[PDB]
């Protein structure tokens, strides 16, 4: 009988996050959450490709959780009756029954209920995982989001300093994997089930198709780029539940970067560009020095360009000439340098 | 003239580890050393697919070897008359001579012995390396394994503190390029030489069609599934020479993780997934919390599932409820919830 | 108005460095660089393949620049006439306007004059970044390079030591996407615009078809191997703008290696193979403790035998038989051996 005050969560999408305190002089709490697996049809890419994706509660990724060490996470996992297959959940920041997998698979028409204590600090990857070739099926159509763990003092530098953030952003990137008719055309389907055997194709070549932030291509820019203004320090999750990427904030840096996302770590400190190992969740944080757009990209450079994966921020303030200045306009080269720059052929 | 006493050392196929202490008061010996070149015809799927491969010992991975700082390690490698070309040894641990390669070249029918100090503490990959082509080739039809050498006080945790593991496994893993016909079939070759040119045209495209432990499909599932209890600490190495890989034990976690495999370094603590650079071995300790089947995988899930990268480990012990438990097992979603749970489509 | 003197630097190409303090007494200065594009047709392998390239100052990868932490970079771009498309440059060491990419397009006939502020200290990448898919597209194509910022008491270990090297080298390593026709013969264009669709097909499925040191396979062996001497401490940037690598010294180590690149943190001690996260920079220290030949690849072994990434370094002095040596030279196997040597079949 485990005897805690209960604490409700209400999940947000991403790439926004539930209301939630950094550092907590609350104790230990059961935090409840609901996860509604949703199997849809969804637009993944600008020419409007659709896919029969499954997700949990409708987004791609699922929405982040966050909770403080310590804490019981009790989920109840919803399956509604208009979906087709069984789904569970596995947390990576769990422990026992293969992260909780073995432990709530459902039927459509069903829901169960799982514990588990969050013994262990940093963002992790949740995903289904019902079992054999179901579990890179269902992982790659959509069903993987984020837990954040926080210490009950909040994040910290590593060296006895405590580190805070003024906005948090949760980008899940996807790995996506479209099948294609013989002239190149991506293949639509009527279901998930009918996609699958020509998906499994497409997956065993190991290339994805597209690479996505929040569900799709453009997701995180335009209307929807990710605001901030100078001053503010920004906490940027990523997660990729298959497959590596490299994130790079263009035009920025990360100041604080837990690469493999576990606080009990220190963070690496100034770094260009970072790795999310496939299967795993980490974090970032930033704070803005000049206004302005900045991309936020994997770095490879064609899978952000040409495949999907670029973000946005557009962020307000002043610019800092200091940093960083046009000296000079562009301009015609002179022609006394003309045969100075014969060296540089 | 090295005046230092012999220490013979008799090697086991992998998973397991032959006998070793991890702290040892003993003095730096001359740790002696068999790798025998076995060229053979092994399955590597579970559908009977066959393959042409090239091993030490007559396993994939090789075995593990285990020494500690400050020992020499001597190192007979042989190469039987009925192999069909020359063979070598590179040990990453190693200085010089291309990690011993360009001293350890030998025709079918000879033997060579090598000599190279420990200097360098972590787990190190060793592997075949003729020249030219013949390099990837040699490794990537098997001839690869690792080389542990410890702290002459044993593992630490980079804090002051001792780490010691009551089990030890070694995971090797192998990626696999097998050609196929135009119906999409593998093929099968009649000596390693008649497969060359075809599997270098798969290699050439960079997209393994395997991806196991310990050489096939299956191979440490089932009857051959890892054993462990509860309350155990367990070191598992984790190898791989020619591509990346990114472990996860799935319901565990990394302890400590020493992901570039390097005792010199702290290892990082509570890892979800890591990640061993190819080229490289790395190491996890992990203390098992909750009895059950455990899944060891490549967390691409594609390579886990669909290529052959999954092993387990089965547990024995009590299960704890305070770490996880099944709240309510699966039941019908009730229809008051019904509005409720429209916000998360 | 900066009121600080100015220092001209004279580029040189890779791998070799221009001259420049590591430790320095110098207050912060506007160091001056001047970059000029080429778009310019290359040889990229051994087999004579061109390749329509475009670069910074006619080589790839573009020179290293090298500067103290809190100088100011101020970098001519100059776009000659000759040349057929704009181009700009992206410093992932700066802050603010995507890295000066939003303040440094230019058409041909155009140069352009940015300063930026060296408030980060590591090893990072530089590169052209026009907009949209041109950015992969000039990337790939060569655009790109690195920048090193030096603290101004030089390198240390992370634990209050001095770390000091005598001979610098960069190794810009390139993947590239060279088109095909139906035979496998690689395409020839006459311009890199006629080059561009069907080099994005290519781009498209992530695999390159070389992967290249210098711009070429072979250009840093034979007659262009890269010399040290028995003692020398080395310094070894690696860039990889695009694409993961993992950098291997093959009868080496790495001493002390920051792999993520930033000088702020520890680097890590005695690895056998490091992992450059695509979009980054990381560099090696390595004091040579044996002479002969060393490779230097990427440790994915097809990349570096089959596709073009192999380095060498040639290194003078006396062979050390306590760290390495050949107890036997090759020799019959003894038949006294056959029961024992059947165990390891
Ligand atoms: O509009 C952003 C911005 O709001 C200020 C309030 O004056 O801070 C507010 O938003 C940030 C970013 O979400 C949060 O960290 C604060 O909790 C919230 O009060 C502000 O500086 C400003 O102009
Ligand atoms: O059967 C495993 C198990 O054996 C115990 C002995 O009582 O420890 C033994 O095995 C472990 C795992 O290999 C080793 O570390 C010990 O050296 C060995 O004595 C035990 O707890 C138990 O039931
Ligand atoms: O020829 C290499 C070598 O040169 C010595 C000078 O006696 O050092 C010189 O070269 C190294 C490697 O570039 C530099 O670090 C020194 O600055 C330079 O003086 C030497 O030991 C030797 O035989
Ligand atoms: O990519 C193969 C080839 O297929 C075509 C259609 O025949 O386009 C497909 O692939 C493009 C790249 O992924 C997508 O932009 C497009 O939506 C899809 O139809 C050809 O245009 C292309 O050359
Ligand atoms: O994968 C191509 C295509 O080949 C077939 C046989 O024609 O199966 C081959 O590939 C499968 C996936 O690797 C393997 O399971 C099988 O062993 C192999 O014969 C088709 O079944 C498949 O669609
Ligand atoms: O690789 C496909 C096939 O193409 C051929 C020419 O028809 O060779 C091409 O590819 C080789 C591997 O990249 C290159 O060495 C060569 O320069 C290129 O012409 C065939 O030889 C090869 O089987
Ligand atoms: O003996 C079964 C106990 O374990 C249950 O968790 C799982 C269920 O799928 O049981 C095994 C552990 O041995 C699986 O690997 C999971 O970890 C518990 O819910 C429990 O009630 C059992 O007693
Ligand atoms: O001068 C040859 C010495 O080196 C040998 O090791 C290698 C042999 O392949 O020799 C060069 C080093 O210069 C190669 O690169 C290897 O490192 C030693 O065995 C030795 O006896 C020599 O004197
Ligand atoms: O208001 C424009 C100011 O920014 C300029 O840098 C960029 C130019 O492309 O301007 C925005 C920042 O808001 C872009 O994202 C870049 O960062 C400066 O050169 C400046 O003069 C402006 O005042
Ligand atoms: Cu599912
Ligand atoms: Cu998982
Ligand atoms: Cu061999
Ligand atoms: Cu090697
Ligand atoms: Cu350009
Ligand atoms: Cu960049």
């Given at each position: 009988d485990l005897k805690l005050p209960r604490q409700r969560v209400d999940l947000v999408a991403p790439p926004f996050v539930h209301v939630h305190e950094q550092?907590?002089?609350?104790?230990?709490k059961i935090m409840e959450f609901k996860l509604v697996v949703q199997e849809k049809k969804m637009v993944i890419d600008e020419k409007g490709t659709t896919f029969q994706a499954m997700t949990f509660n409708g987004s791609m990724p699922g929405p982040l959780m966050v909770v403080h060490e310590g804490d019981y996470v009790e989920v109840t996992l919803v399956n509604p009756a208009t979906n087709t297959m069984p789904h569970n959940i596995d947390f990576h920041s769990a422990t026992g029954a293969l992260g909780g997998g073995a432990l709530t698979l459902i039927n459509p028409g069903e829901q169960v209920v799982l514990r588990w204590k969050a013994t262990r600090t940093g963002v992790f990857v949740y995903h289904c995982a019902p079992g054999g070739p179901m579990i890179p099926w269902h992982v790659v159509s959509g069903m993987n989001g984020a837990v954040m763990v926080l210490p009950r003092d909040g994040l910290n530098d590593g060296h006895g300093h405590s580190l805070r953030y003024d906005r948090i952003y949760y980008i899940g990137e996807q790995d996506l994997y479209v099948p294609r008719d013989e002239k190149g055309n991506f293949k639509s389907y009527d279901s998930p089930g009918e996609a699958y055997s020509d998906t499994e194709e497409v997956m065993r070549?190991?290339?994805?198709?597209h690479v996505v932030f929040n569900?799709?291509?453009?997701?995180?820019?335009?209307?929807?780029a990710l605001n901030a203004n100078v001053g503010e320090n920004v906490l940027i999750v990523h997660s990729q539940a298959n497959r590596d990427s490299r994130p790079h904030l263009i035009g920025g840096?990360?100041?604080?970067?837990?690469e493999t996302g576990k606080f009990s770590n220190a963070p690496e400190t100034g770094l260009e560009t970072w790795f999310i190992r496939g299967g795993s969740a980490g974090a970032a944080l930033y704070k803005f020095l000049q206004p302005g757009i900045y991309a936020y990209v994997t770095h490879n450079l064609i899978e952000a360009a040409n495949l999907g994966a670029t973000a946005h921020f557009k962020v307000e303030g002043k610019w800092n000439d200091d940093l960083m200045?046009?000296?000079?306009?562009p301009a015609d080269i002179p022609t006394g340098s003309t045969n100075e720059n014969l060296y540089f052929q």
């Open positions: 550092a907590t002089k609350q104790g230990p070549k190991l290339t994805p198709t569900g799709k291509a453009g997701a995180l820019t335009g209307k929807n840096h990360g100041d604080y970067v837990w200045t046009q000296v000079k306009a």
